[PDB]
Amino acid sequence: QNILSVHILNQQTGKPAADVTVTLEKKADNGWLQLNTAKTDKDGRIKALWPEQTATTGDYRVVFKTGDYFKKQNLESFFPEIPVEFHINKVNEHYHVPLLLSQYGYSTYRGS
Amino acid sequence: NILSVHILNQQTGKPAADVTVTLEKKADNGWLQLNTAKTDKDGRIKALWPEQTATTGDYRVVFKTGDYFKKQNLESFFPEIPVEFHINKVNEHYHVPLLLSQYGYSTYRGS
Amino acid sequence: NILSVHILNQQTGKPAADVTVTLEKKADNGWLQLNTAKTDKDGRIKALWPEQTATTGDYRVVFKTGDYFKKQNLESFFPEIPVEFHINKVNEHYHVPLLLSQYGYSTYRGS
Amino acid sequence: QNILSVHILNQQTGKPAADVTVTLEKKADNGWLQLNTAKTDKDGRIKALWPEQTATTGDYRVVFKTGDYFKKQNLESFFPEIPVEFHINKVNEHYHVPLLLSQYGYSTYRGS
Ligand SMILES: [Br-]
Ligand SMILES: [Br-]
Ligand SMILES: [Br-]
Ligand SMILES: [Br-]
Ligand SMILES: [Zn+2]
Ligand SMILES: [Zn+2]
Ligand SMILES: [Zn+2]
Ligand SMILES: [Zn+2]
Ligand SMILES: [Zn+2]
Ligand SMILES: [Zn+2]
Ligand SMILES: [Zn+2]
Ligand SMILES: [Zn+2]
Ligand SMILES: [Zn+2]
Ligand SMILES: [Zn+2]
Ligand SMILES: [Zn+2]
Ligand SMILES: [Zn+2]
Ligand SMILES: [Zn+2]
Ligand SMILES: [Zn+2]
Ligand SMILES: [Zn+2]
Known part of the structure; x- marks a missing residue:
């Protein structure tokens, strides 16, 4: 499993x-320095978002470009994009950051 | 009103x-039903408790959200959304919001 | 298993x-009880349907989270968390996660 | 009602x-250009966060310094802080951005 x-x-669609x-x-x-960009697959996943470069401890930001996602569907959204900032204090561990998304609301958390 | x-x-904000x-x-x-009402134009029911003193214990609000979406010609995962909560202090203000989507929701103790 | x-x-991630x-x-x-189980060390119940064929209908999973918190001497607004959902298609996979805190939660149809 | x-x-406390x-x-x-900084009162609220200058349409972000908040309680959090980005498309509207906060999870939305 990727870091x-x-x-x-x-x-809205489940x-x-x-x-x-x-x-x-x-x-x-x-x-902030960009380390990578990718696109979620057909299952809404990016299983491995870290580039092929050793991860160091620090703070990181993932930015979900959800505004564009909704825009392609002719849907308005309150958020042009959704940044999520988090600590990586242990490079041995797996970090999982799901996004539960609606047009005018969202939830994020550390998953397993 | 408690x-x-x-x-x-x-989905609409x-x-x-x-x-x-x-x-x-x-x-x-x-369970025993205490009340039923409908959210007003601001999506609120400010005073859902009936005209009776509350006692400590478990209660349940049920938001009939499947109907709400059905009127929009929209499908939802949930026929309705029950939320069970505990009243411990009886003269305290209890606030149960629902953040609703067709296939997801959140609730909490509001202010 | 569906x-x-x-x-x-x-609160712990x-x-x-x-x-x-x-x-x-x-x-x-x-409501008729069809099964009961305990989340494993990964917080999962991979196969919650009993070993009888699934039928269409409405169903309710009840996460006994008030008990989970009480074991840790933590109070919760919710004594338990029911989630009601439609099963319209018996052949497909239904997944119901719970994001849990003492005074709030979220649930949805997962992947 | 304030912009x-x-x-x-x-x-976790309700x-x-x-x-x-x-x-x-x-x-x-x-x-990104800082416009204002402020502190939630006892009710966890900032009821007017806009400064004393006219609002224009555009993209904005509030950053809730929640890492500090938890750090004061000797509690860890996944997030050093929580940025929330949003559009203001109509300047005569009221924008309300609640945060539902846990150590390892949060939700946000456009409130009323
Ligand atoms: Br993933
Ligand atoms: Br209300
Ligand atoms: Br599972
Ligand atoms: Br406020
Ligand atoms: Zn850090
Ligand atoms: Zn993972
Ligand atoms: Zn995932
Ligand atoms: Zn993992
Ligand atoms: Zn109780
Ligand atoms: Zn209230
Ligand atoms: Zn309210
Ligand atoms: Zn109150
Ligand atoms: Zn049904
Ligand atoms: Zn699944
Ligand atoms: Zn699962
Ligand atoms: Zn599945
Ligand atoms: Zn507020
Ligand atoms: Zn914009
Ligand atoms: Zn407001």
Whole structure:
């Protein structure tokens, strides 16, 4: 299992959100360096979001480009995109960050 | 009044209006219905408790959200959404919001 | 097996283990118990349907989370958390996760 | 009713999260631009978070400094902070962004 997985469930259809761009960024100085970008697969997943580069401890941000996702469906959303910031304090462990998504609401958490 | 509920449709970011919500008390066997009402235009029922003092114990509100979506020609995972909660202090304000989507929801103790 | 559930404790970011979960079917305004089990160390019940053929209908899983918290001397707003859902298609997989805190939760149809 | 209100509910206590720093930023051309900073009162609320300048349409973000909030209680959290990004498409509307907060999970939405 990859250090970082993400997935998106669309709570309006009760199905995965497919083909959503998701970026990964590392905090550095007062900003953020992009480490990767990928798109959720047909099951709404990116099982392995970390690039082929050793992960270091630090703070990271995943950005779910959900605004574009909704825009392709002619749907408005309150959020142009959804950033989620989290600590990686242990590079030996698996980090899983699902997104439960609606147009005007969402939930995120550390999964298993 | 010791019990308020509201429903926010997370798909529209607007209140769910005219949704039937029931209130029940847990009895020794089964439940007893205390009240029924409908959310107003702001998705609220400000005063869901009937005109009777509350006692400590378990209660259940049931948001009839399947009907609400059906009127929109929309399918939902849930026929309805029961929320069971515990009243421990009887003169305290209890607030049970529902953040609703067709295939997902959240509830909590509100302010 | 057509029904899985899991519970994630949003306060620890870890699964909720050894939580009792019942499954019931709706019948005549009541509910018939069909099975009961305990989430494993991963907070999962992979196969909650009993070993009889599934039928269409409405069903209710009840996560005994008030008991889960009480074991840890933690109070909860909710003595248990019922989730009601349609089964329209008997051949498909139904997955009902619970994101759990003492005074709030979320549930949805998972993948 | 104010262009921007936020509040926080601690889902672990079922009570408001108090004295939590919240910043407001606009997505300006030169990067994100701080507009205001403020603290939830005892009720976990900031009922007017907009500064004393006219609002324009555009993208904005509030950052709830919840990592600090938990750190004061000797509690760990997955998130150092929680940014929430959103569109203001109509300046004469009221935007309300609640946060339902747990150590390893949160929800947010456009409230009323
Ligand atoms: Br995944
Ligand atoms: Br209300
Ligand atoms: Br499972
Ligand atoms: Br507020
Ligand atoms: Zn996943
Ligand atoms: Zn960190
Ligand atoms: Zn995982
Ligand atoms: Zn894992
Ligand atoms: Zn309310
Ligand atoms: Zn009770
Ligand atoms: Zn209230
Ligand atoms: Zn209150
Ligand atoms: Zn599961
Ligand atoms: Zn049904
Ligand atoms: Zn499943
Ligand atoms: Zn499945
Ligand atoms: Zn508020
Ligand atoms: Zn915008
Ligand atoms: Zn408001």
